[PDB]
Structure 1
Amino acid sequence: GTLFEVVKLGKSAMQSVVDDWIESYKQDRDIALLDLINFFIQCSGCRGTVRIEMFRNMQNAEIIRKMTEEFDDYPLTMPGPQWKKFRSNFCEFIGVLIRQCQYSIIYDEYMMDTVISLLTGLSDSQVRAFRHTSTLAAMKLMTALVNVALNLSIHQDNTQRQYEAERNKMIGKRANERLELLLQKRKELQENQDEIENMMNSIFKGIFVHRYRDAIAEIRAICIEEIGVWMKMYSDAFLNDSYLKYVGWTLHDRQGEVRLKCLKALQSLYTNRELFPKLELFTNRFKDRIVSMTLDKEYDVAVEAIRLVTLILHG
């Protein structure tokens, strides 16, 4: 509308184009997912694009096979001013997309399963471009879903409090309307969180557990940085000795870049004098490695290790 109306509503190109995409999904899911599929393809630097006859009538693996061939250095490795903000933007895009899809489209059983199936397939690819792009996307995707779970978690607690104050209000009395609605709200929200947890598991078992050991250091670096983000954000699901073994196993990684990340992640855990109890077995297991890394070889790795150890000392 008015210039004042658009300035007082900082909808950016991204949010604008996510809002357009959401509207295009409501008309025709197929073409919208087609456009979203082609987006991930184009972000890898792949020169081909999928048509609706392929999307409808080929099995993912086949689509990936055909896009593999059409591959002339990709947008994420590009240097120069016209790609400085690409990574940053690509990551924000995934966050905006899912933030916006989080209350309806995400729980449709078509949109997330389509994306995660693509990202999983692109993460198994011989092409570096594909492995790098999909994995980074999947790591930002997991974090987006974690933020969805945290939002349910709040709503689950308001619906929990509201049911308690209505179960108690009644007692001895026939279960009225507010009490059947709330007892329904509560199941719906938990069935939402199942579905989130599910997608998280598909992303973790399918993409993470394979990529965190990847040939390329940047891909190992992306996986570690993010498991560290999940473990801080959502302690109860991700902060456990099974998931932590991935971070420990990686402390022994060959690359400064990567060792640096494991320590940065563990740092942010140990600062919280609270999940400190839940790091007790992990610390006993890798004190020898954490501590050994204070004289690492790479100065800036060693610095971090020393900082980590001082943090472990203080608790």
Structure 2
Amino acid sequence: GTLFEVVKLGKSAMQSVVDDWIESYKQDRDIALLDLINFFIQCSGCRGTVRIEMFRNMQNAEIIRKMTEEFDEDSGDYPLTMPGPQWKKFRSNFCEFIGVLIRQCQYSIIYDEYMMDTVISLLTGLSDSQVRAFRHTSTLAAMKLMTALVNVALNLSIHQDNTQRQYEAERNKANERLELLLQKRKELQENQDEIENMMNSIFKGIFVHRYRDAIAEIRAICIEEIGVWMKMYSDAFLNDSYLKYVGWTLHDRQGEVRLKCLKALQSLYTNRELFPKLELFTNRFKDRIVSMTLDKEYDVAVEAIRLVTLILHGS
């Protein structure tokens, strides 16, 4: 509305486009998911357009194969790898968009059994594309999606704590206000459970394949982001099964990737509370970690020395 109401509210570029999308979704889901699908397709640098009757008749496999056919056979150069000056902040807007979208959907739409299954399906299928641009765009998106879901789970944890307190204050006094709180307690656990299944799909469907991708930037993206999930939500993500992937990737040929493992590991070891869950990992990868303090790459070696310094200050 008025200059004042707009300024007072102060909506980001990405929040404005998300809120319009969400309203579009509420009028027609199919058209809105179609526009979201064509978003991931166009962000990959694909010239093609998924039509609504393709959306309603075809599987992802065929949609993707059909959209695969509409690339520039000549150029392998796409928005996540174009230098600029436009494409400067595209990558930043592309990442913020995903976060905002899920943040804004996180109380209803996210749970409607259609929006997230449509997205994770497409992103999973694009992530197995032979086309470098599809793998890279989808995989980045999927990683950022995962992070956004982990925040959904963190907010749910605060709401569970609030409701637990409210139930206990009301118990210590069985009217309508109790069973409602017992019912909100149950609904929030069910919400956590559904978020977990989406996280499991993205992890089993995309992360565990892309982390060892041929492209070094894809490897980097996975490793950086699993670092984030482990710091943010240790109970679910910081375990020997997942640390294995951070461990195995210390040996990466490319400096950028190794750098990312080390920074991933710094953010865990820095945390006095997480150290007991790192003991076995330190033992299995001590040699490889410690080797990297004189890594041929100067910027890696620096980060390994910081790591080892953190590891030491722990015990």
TM-score tier, shorter chain, comes to: over 0.9
Cα distance in 2 between the residues matched to 1:215 and 1:27: 41
Report Cα offsets for 1:164-196 as digits up to 9, x if no partner: 23334xxxxx93322211111011000000000
Cα distance in 2 between the residues matched to 1:4 and 1:162: 37
Cα distance in 2 between the residues matched to 1:10 and 1:176: 42
Cα distance in 2 between the residues matched to 1:273 and 1:282: 15
* 1:111 CA drift (Å): 0.2
Cα distance in 1 between the residues matched to 2:56 and 2:206: 24
* 1:258 CA drift (Å): 0.3
Q: Confirm whether residue 225 of structure 1 aligns to residue 229 of structure 2.
A: no
**Aligned-partner SS, 1:80:** coil
* 1:85 CA drift (Å): 0.5
Cα distance in 2 between the residues matched to 1:280 and 1:26: 49
Cα distance in 2 between the residues matched to 1:160 and 1:140: 30
Aligned to 1:50: 50
**Aligned-partner SS, 2:79:** coil
* 1:296 CA drift (Å): 1.0
Report Cα offsets for 1:151-170 as digits up to 9, x if no partner: 000000111112223334xx
Provide TM-score, normalisation by structure 1.
Answer: 0.96
Q: Confirm whether residue 192 of structure 1 aligns to residue 196 of structure 2.
A: no
Q: Show structure 1 runs of 5+ residues with no match.
A: 169-173
Cα distance in 2 between the residues matched to 1:135 and 1:304: 26
* 1:79 CA drift (Å): 1.0
* 1:124 CA drift (Å): 0.2
Cα distance in 1 between the residues matched to 2:15 and 2:165: 34
Given the superposition, is the C-alpha separation of residues 187 and 290 from structure 1 closer, same or farther in structure 2, using an over 3 Å criterion? same
* 1:226 CA drift (Å): 0.2
Report Cα offsets for 1:6-63 as digits up to 9, x if no partner: 2222113321111111001011000000000000000000000101110000011000
Cα distance in 2 between the residues matched to 1:197 and 1:262: 24
**Aligned-partner SS, 1:175:** coil
* 1:245 CA drift (Å): 0.4
Cα distance in 2 between the residues matched to 1:45 and 1:149: 32
**Aligned-partner SS, 2:133:** helix
Report Cα offsets for 1:132-167 as digits up to 9, x if no partner: 000000000000000000000000011111222333
Aligned to 1:78: 82
* 1:213 CA drift (Å): 0.3
**Aligned-partner SS, 2:9:** coil
Aligned to 1:15: 15
Q: Confirm whether residue 136 of structure 1 aligns to residue 135 of structure 2.
A: no
Aligned to 1:159: 163
* 1:312 CA drift (Å): 0.5
* 1:281 CA drift (Å): 0.9
**Aligned-partner SS, 1:109:** coil
**Aligned-partner SS, 2:11:** coil
Cα distance in 2 between the residues matched to 1:4 and 1:183: 42
Report Cα offsets for 1:200-236 as digits up to 9, x if no partner: 0000000000000000000000000000000001111
Q: Show structure 2 runs of 5+ residues with no match.
A: 72-76
Report Cα offsets for 1:255-292 as digits up to 9, x if no partner: 10000000000001001111111111111110011001
Quote the sequence identity (%): 100
Aligned to 1:2: 2
Cα distance in 2 between the residues matched to 1:3 and 1:122: 42
Cα distance in 2 between the residues matched to 1:193 and 1:252: 35
* 1:88 CA drift (Å): 0.6
Cα distance in 2 between the residues matched to 1:184 and 1:102: 19
**Aligned-partner SS, 1:96:** helix
Aligned residues: 309
Cα distance in 1 between the residues matched to 2:9 and 2:177: 37
**Aligned-partner SS, 1:4:** helix
Cα distance in 1 between the residues matched to 2:86 and 2:38: 21
Cα distance in 2 between the residues matched to 1:152 and 1:2: 34
Q: Confirm whether residue 67 of structure 1 aligns to residue 71 of structure 2.
A: no
Provide TM-score, normalisation by structure 2.
Answer: 0.96
* 1:4 CA drift (Å): 2.6
